[PDB]
Structure formats: structure tokens, C-alpha cells
Amino acid sequence: MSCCPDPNPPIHKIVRKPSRILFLMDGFDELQGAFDEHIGPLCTDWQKAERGDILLSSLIRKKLLPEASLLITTRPVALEKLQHLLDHPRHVEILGFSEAKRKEYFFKYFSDEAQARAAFSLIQENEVLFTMCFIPLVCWIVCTGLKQQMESGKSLAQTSKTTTAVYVFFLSSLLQPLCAHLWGLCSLAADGIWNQKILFEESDLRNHGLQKADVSAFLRMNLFQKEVDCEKFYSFIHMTFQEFFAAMYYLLELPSRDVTVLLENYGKFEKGYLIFVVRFLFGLVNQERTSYLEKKLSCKISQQIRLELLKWIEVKAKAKKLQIQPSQLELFYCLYEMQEEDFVQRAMDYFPKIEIN
Amino acid sequence: NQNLTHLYLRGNTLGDKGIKLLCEGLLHPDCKLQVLELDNCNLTSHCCWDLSTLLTSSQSLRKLSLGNNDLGDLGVMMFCEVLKQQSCLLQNLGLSEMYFNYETKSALETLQEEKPELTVVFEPS
Secondary structure, X not given: OOOOOOOOOOOOXXXXXXXXXXXXXXXXXXXXXXXXXXXXXXXXXXXXXXOHHHHHHHXXXXXXXXXXXXXXXXXXXXXXXXXXXXXXXXXXXXXXXXXXXXXXXXXXHOOOHHHHHXXXXXXXXXXXXXXXXXXXXXXXXXXXXXXHHHHHOOOOOOOOOOHHHHHHHHHHHHHXXXXXXXXXXXXXXXXXXXXOXXXXXXXXXXXOOOOOHHHHHHHHOOOEEOOOOOOXXXXXXOHHHHHHHHHHHOOEOXXXXXXXXXXXXXXXXXXXXXXXXXXXXXXXXXXOOOOOOHXXXXXXXXXXXXXXXXXXXXXXXXXXXXXXXXXXXXXXXXXHHOOOHHHHHHHHOOOOOOOOO | OOOOOEEEOOOOOOHHHHHHHHHHHHXXXXXXXXXXXEOOOOOOOOHHHXXXXXXXXXXXXXXXXXXXXXXXXXXXXXXXXXXXXXXXXXXXXXXXXXXXXXXXXXXXXXXXXXXXXXXXXOOOO
């Protein structure tokens, strides 16, 4: 599947010889579906057909093609379900951009200094966004947002203070010029998160109200991707966006729309841990809101959800366990996004002891 | 030298050009070499033409031990086809320590059965 166009490559030749082969298992955490680290068979004998979880597990455990090398990329949260299959791994952590590299990114992204310098200053002046631009995705989103602002020549202002604000900002400048189909896109994302789907067929888009005409709008206004690498699988340009859209779904106005149930399944591989779904849900549930898509978000629901979110924090903050869902600092990220002192202070009163790293 | 009956060059990085030049000698009507051993000699697909020529041209050669080299999956198929026309090769044909596909192994097995005068070919299994 991952080889040259020839459907019958030399699988039975040197391709069977281990130690000269390295696998790149990119996105362990994106393996949609339950992943059982404890299985019956260990699918030895590569030619034997078996389920994907078993096949991957067998490769991961070095039972399939033993002595072969294996590189795995993953979100650190998913290590909970991966560390049981590594035995003797070398763990490498990926760190974001340093101040020097943030600067290089901006100058490489923009066509010339005339705009790159403006972009750099506009962001550098914003302590929060500059710090957030630690992440390649965030600086990309901000740069893309600026590029769109440059095309219109409106202002290039970048005043966002949260992760949510960046994502909301990005859509505001993208969909406002669409607004009538945002619900369908949000529904699609929510369905995907709950039904363990990242890659969508055109049939799935149509079934959520997005058929060709609006879908193309998202492909043009870099929001949503088609996967045209000899395929026809639509998806969000990044998993963080899919989680963002799912989060908005719960707050608009078909999995359930029950946030309590959503939260109950937070600390689980099956749903992708819902880390950004909740982080965004918190940022979105606010009173300090404005227009441009935000006004289409349900205020009445936000008030109903806010209460349950506060209860959720109290219940989880109470836990003193390690390698558990929101390990203190994660709750702080949620509260950081929801920049409203009334809520945050009430929530923080449930943290008599703070243990963070 | 008509007294030279065995020549062992295995391990020498002769290359394809090397085989070409050796063949010019081996194809000479007075050459009496019976056994030529060529294990890993840094060989490739090209030399198969010259080796094929050798297999059917020389009336003296009896054993040609091509070993651990990338002879080629198609290259060996030429050997399979030509070693039917009353070839004088009777012994080890080499092809050991070399990965072949299904059709190739079948052809080599067929050759072994149809031409029993060829003692053993010696595939990897």
C-alpha cells in the first residue's frame, strides 16, 4: 500500500530481510478504534491475514519481522497504551520552535521582508501568541490568518489570547466572506470523533449537508483537505481542528450532544483522549464573546455546559493519581483558555494542593 | 593454457565488465576450463547475457558455480530457458544465496526434473 505504483512489488525478496528495514509508524494516537495492548495471537508470519490492531501490535512488539527497526511517532498521552509494547525503546521528545526558529519560520513563510517583518512584529508584541508560536501549527495558523488579512488589507491585527481565540479567529476570517454550512461541518467533525473516523468519503460529507459546492469552498480556503494522493478521502487539515469543530458542535443552536457523556469518556484511547475537544469546549464556553460566527454559538447552552464543566474540574482535580486524565496542569490549560476570573477562581478553589511539572 | 581445468575467482569484485572479458577467453575454442566458480563477485543483471553465452557456447565447461551475487530475477530465467538445448553443463549451476520469485523457482524445479543430467542446480530452497 505504501510502495511504488506496482501492486505486486518484490515482497518475497530482500524486503523480507530484517535489520535493513525501518518502519515509520506515524501517529500511533490516530489509530482510530479501540486498541487492545493485550491480545490472544501475536500474528507471526507476515503473510497471514489478521486484524489491524493485532498486525500493528505484532510489529510493535517485534514479533513480526523481528530484528527490523521501528520508529513510532505519538502524542505523549497515548504512551499510556504504547509503553506496554516497547520493552526497550529509545524515547525522543520533540520540542517546538525557539525564538530564533520562530523568526525564521515567519520570514520563510511570507514572500518578502515587507510582510514578514510586519508579521513578526505584530505577533512578537503579543506575548501570548509569541509564546504559543512555540508550536509549528499555531504559528502556521497565525501566519495563514495574516496572509488572508494581507490579501484583503484590513489591518493584520493579531490580538488573540488563547488557543481557542486563534482557532476562532482563523475561521472568522475564512468563513465569514460557509456560515450557512458551518453546522454541517461541525456535525461532521463530531460524528468523526465519536465514530472513530478521520478520513471521510464523499458520501459522509453529503450525509452531513456538505455536498461538492461547499466542500470545494473549504478546499480552496485551506480549512479542509481532500487527500488526492491517488485517493478520495476528505479530512480536516489537522486533528486539532477536527476536535475544535466537534467542540463547537456541542455549543451550536449526531452522536449525542451530551457533554456529560463526552467528558465521562475523556481519558480513553478510543476517542483520541478528547484533549482538544475539551480544551476548546472550555475556551468556547464563555460570556466574553463577540460577532463573526461566535454569535451563532448558543449562549443558553454555554450557560448549561459551564456548570457541568465546573463540576468536572472539581471531580477530576480531587484525584491524586498519576498517569491519569487531567493531571493538574492539563486542567490549568483548560482554565487558561477560559479566561474568565469568576469561573477560574471558583475552579481553582478545588486545588488545595498543586503538583505540576 | 589447455591444462587449466579449474578456476576459482569467488570474492573478487570482478564486476560485469570482468565477466565480459573472462568470457572472451572462455569462449575461445581451445579453452578447456571445466569448473568456474563465481560466488560473490559483485555481479549484476548485465553479466547474464555473457554468462548465458558461456553456458551454451563452451563445449568444455561442466560446472558454473554462480553464488552470492545479484544475478537478477530475470537473468536466471534466461538460464532456465537456454539450458534446455543440449547444454554441456552437468554440475552445480550455482544460484545459491540468491532470492528468486515463485515463477523462477518453479522454472528451476522444472529444469531439474526435465534435465536430470544436470546433477543438482542448488537453489536456496
